[PDB]
Amino acid sequence: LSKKAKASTVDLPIESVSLSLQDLIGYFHPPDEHLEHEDKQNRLRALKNRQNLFQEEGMINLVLECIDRLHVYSSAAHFADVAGREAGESWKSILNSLYELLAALIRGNRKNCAQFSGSLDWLISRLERLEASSGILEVLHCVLVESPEALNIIKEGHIKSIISLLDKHGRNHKVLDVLCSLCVCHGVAVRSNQHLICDNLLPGRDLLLQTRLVNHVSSMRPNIFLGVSEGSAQYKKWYYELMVDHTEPFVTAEATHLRVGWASTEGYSPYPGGGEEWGGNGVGDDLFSYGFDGLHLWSGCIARTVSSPNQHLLRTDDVISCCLDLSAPSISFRINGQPVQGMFENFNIDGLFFPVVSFSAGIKVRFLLGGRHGEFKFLPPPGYA
Amino acid sequence: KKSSTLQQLISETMVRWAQESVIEDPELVRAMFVLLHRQYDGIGGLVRALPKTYTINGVSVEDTINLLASLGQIRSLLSVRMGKEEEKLMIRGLGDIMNNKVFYQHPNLMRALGMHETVMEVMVNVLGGGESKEITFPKMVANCCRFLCYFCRISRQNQKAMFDHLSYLLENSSVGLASPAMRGSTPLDVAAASVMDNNELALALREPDLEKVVRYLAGCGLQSCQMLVSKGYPDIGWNPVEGERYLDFLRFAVFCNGESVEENANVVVRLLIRRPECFGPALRGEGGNGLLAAMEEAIKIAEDPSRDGPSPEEDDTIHMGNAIMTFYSALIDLLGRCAPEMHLIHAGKGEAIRIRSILRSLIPLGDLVGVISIAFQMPTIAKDGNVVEPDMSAGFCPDHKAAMVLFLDRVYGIEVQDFLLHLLEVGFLPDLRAAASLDTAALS
Amino acid sequence: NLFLQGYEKSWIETEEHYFEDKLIEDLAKPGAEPPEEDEGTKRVDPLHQLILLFSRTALTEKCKLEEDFLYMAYADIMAKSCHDEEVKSFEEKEMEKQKLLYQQARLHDRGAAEMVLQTISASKGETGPMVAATLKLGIAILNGGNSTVQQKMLDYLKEKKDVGFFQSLAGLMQSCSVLDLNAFERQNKAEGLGMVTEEGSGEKVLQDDEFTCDLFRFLQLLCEGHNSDFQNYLRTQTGNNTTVNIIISTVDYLLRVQESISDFYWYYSGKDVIDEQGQRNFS
């Protein structure tokens, strides 16, 4: 077929090859664990003798030759164009069965695993192909688990290719198992392999899932609900104050969270929108809330540094004044009577607004809402209610 | 009444578990029965621990702690693969152990710690790694052999402990014999130091080991040296540089503390005469010119630069003529040391007479007389006050004549007055005259 | 340090206490089985489990037999439990026979004969402490010509058609040692020199007398009582593909021992008086 003889003249025993491959898989199938121990030993001896005879007759090189001849075709569609359509459908199955047979032939036999050391380099050259990645990975794992020599052939480029398999094919625990087998074999650690795997995988922090401790953050809000709409009898300007009685900077290993500002509901439901019910998210961690921490303006989980007189993260005895105007979308703050040099504009006014404070453990705060509820330390800005 | 004892508690618990359930994991069964046996054989703990118990004074506590830390590093580094950094760590730790004082002061603790076992395990790993790939990390073999040689020299009991592990060393005796500057750093050197100056160990030496050494020596005479011919040294049919080492080992095996172990000497002589290829081309008997002609040929090679050097760091230039000459001197020395004692000949033992007759047939008197008659080349001074020095690492050495004299005294014997006079005239007066001429302060 | 070593050898090694029979009797008790929720076949006793573990280890396929301290200790314990060893009467001797037949029953009812066959088969003709312990256990369970044990061994051998057992027996026979006049002369030379190692010099001549005696006592007990079937099996193993003539191997070893004894006699022919070491070697 490679030499381009016409299709019907060339005969490919596709069904015979598939059936023979399945029968050989059954022949080299490992013993079952529910069998009695003597049967275990007998079946293991028979399998080992079968593997030894196959290796001595060179049944492994023939499988490799068939595999190499089958990989010349890029895809099943291309192989179906060259050969017949039935061969096109059977091409993937035959290719997987060949790799399974190779793995079954080399598994558990140290001599075969040692003789596969020379061909390891050729094997890992097609790991990137999705058509044979699982089979190549299984064969590589079976070789590396039992061949101490094989680790001496595996090099830095092969380790990089195995690592890049995770980047290109996504998360797969079998690649991790192969990498684990690379590090230690038969109680002996390959320190060069350990160093290469560490220095090539860990620093990226882009493939393996990351872990950290996060302080819990809760939200306090009053009952008031503030909204703007056409033909609505609500004033457009509002103003309230927050007082910080006490705040511990580091109650735990992480920094204490303390943010104040306004949040917006989704639509007309009385439920805050766009944020998780529980976790480390607070005011300003979504696009439905707007917050201030004393140094940065928080919105959409993004913080930008804003200048102010005597900048400081919120301390004990701090008076925070928040101003919300709905005539033109605008939220402004003022710390201790000194106006901060930043404000929000052109935010969505479809939903309702309400004051909110987000915090971690270790705060002591009071809502100075005005009137009977509170007394404003600083007199409200003109036109603000 | 409770158990009131950990022993009784274990004895009840293990049996109760075993009779309660059929344990499926073999390791659990093994651990439980090991523990039960330990409870029922409490004297076993003492009989096992006491051999590994040592006592030291308070003044050496810090030094012992340092040695134990170094030994722990070397032990823990058995679980990692051989590499550059591991090589460096082995080397620094072994050197620290050598420099440490308790290593010399307390050999019994050193032996109880199993230090030689760990060092030889490192050596086995290095040698086994790449059997077809010759030898990798060649400085482990050197450092480990040096450590083991010093360990042998420390005490006699350590020497016997190292002698226990003899067959493996002789099997890998051919690791670094051809390469120079490795003297005292090959497994053959470890074996020689293990059998050195110990009558008990020399008598405990077996025949198969001597057969192995003799076969290696016969190969060194039949086949050339692959590494030397690869580096470009002229090709000759035999391998003097390794033959000399294999002959030195047999010398140490047969000769000990001034006398000669006849049991180990007769076997060596019989094996050497059984395989005549061990005697070098001059003495093979197949048209061999003879020892006297061979050493003249070696001298001529020494003057010739082409055959002496490879002719495509100074020690790498193996002076071929000096190597052949040293090989012949070592062979003659070994045979002379294997010669029987004269008191046994007085007693009239037939075997000793047979051995002496064999040696006399192997080496004629005239050849020895001629080699003794051969003289050196005296260094001389030029105009400038700088004495020119013929290279001692090359050329004919007095040590070569020393073996000739030993053989002549031990085998042929000087018992005839005119024979003594003739020997004196031909070879002994010129040497003394040269020594007297070399008595000036500058030449001294 | 010298006192620690000397005290060890002189007192701790020499201290002797007997516990083997009690340990085996406690290990053989089925403990509260009806109270336990067995709900099926009788659970194997701890001794049965130990024998099964040791038998599976031997049956496991492997190139060489590794020394196992657990087997080394427990085979000795089981052999001591079996033997547990002036004129006696008929009833006294018959009580001794009956007690021995029960002390042997406690082990051959749990598969000890199959273990001692499997270990010898896996030994592959290599002399070792494991083989010595297995031979001692076999002798202990076969003392007196135990017909049940002989039948179990013969049935096991015929049923699984093991040629490795007989091959290992022949290899052990070949590996058995005899008198060595060269070693004796070297020991005499060392003693004349004056630095004497009695622990080392003595063992070199007749390397393993106890091992040879145990190996041949096992073979005698295997045919004890005129067991015609096993006597013929030792000569020709009909079922097995390969046959080894144990009888001819024994005859060959006898011929080698005779030559060794004759050579030793010739060495003492001229000498009027025999030294104590020579007397010990003769014995």
Add this chain to the structure above:
Amino acid sequence: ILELTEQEELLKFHYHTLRLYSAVCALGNHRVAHALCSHVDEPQLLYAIENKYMPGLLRAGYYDLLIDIHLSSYATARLMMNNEYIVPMTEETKSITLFPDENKKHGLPGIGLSTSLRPRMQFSSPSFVSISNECYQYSPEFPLDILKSKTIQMLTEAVKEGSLHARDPVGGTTEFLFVPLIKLFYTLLIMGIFHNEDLKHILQLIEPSVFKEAPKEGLLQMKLPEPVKLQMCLLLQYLCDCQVRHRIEAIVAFS
């Protein structure tokens, strides 16, 4: 991460990631352990050890990582050093006796004065702002006293709770509840951190009646699975070894 109780693929991938983290630092790769200290921190390890709702696979993996990064290197050295008895001859050595007081009653194993030479404990502070590379020798430092207290408290809770045979063991199974905890306890005991009243309390936990100081059921009588039985056998082996070492030291004292 407690949500991973229902995402199977993420749980499997993270368990294998933890196993890889252990493998890269296995067998005394102190530089790799120092590197991994950045990714898996002390507060995360302590939280994973203490937490009760963690999945069993992640719990076992984090226990193994904590053992491997910090406490494995010294434990291995002391285990290799265990079967050797080099005792200096000092006043403390001479004062040692076989039995504590006049009556021939066995003392509690482990507790007492031991003068045999043992490996030194040395740890390195993991910091990535320092430039010096001398910190790469020695395993990273950990709060051993806090770990000891938490281990004792957790064992005390687990023994009491497991005896009631609840349907919700930590990690989902008795094996997941007990094997990592006993493994950490065994590693700490091998290291030798436990001393005096802590050893007394943990021996009371192991067996109340026998180690009673001069109903309640210990770990030995609670009908535990085979993997935990193996760990119990290891602990009892260590206790026997301690008794043998005490005997050897008393013999040297009399000598």
Add this chain to the structure above:
Amino acid sequence: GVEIETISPGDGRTFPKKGQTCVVHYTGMLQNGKKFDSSRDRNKPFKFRIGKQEVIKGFEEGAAQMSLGQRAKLTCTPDVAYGATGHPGVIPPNATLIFDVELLNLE
């Protein structure tokens, strides 16, 4: 190449003077926001004395331009800390480091 913006004010007078040990709690985070080091996690203050190149030079002068009791966030350009090679296994090559540093005590 180190910009410092204060997070909490200090006394403003007791600057670090030369040959003096500085007691600091620091929290190191990459530019993307992933934390790689923190002394508060180890729960022991960090000690380094000035001018002897123990710590990275960015952390050197960023702490030197500070005052006692002041908390500030220190941005280090790559060339001052692990310029091209990076720290093997922790910091990737060519990385900008952010440190939250508090100067507890000077002795």
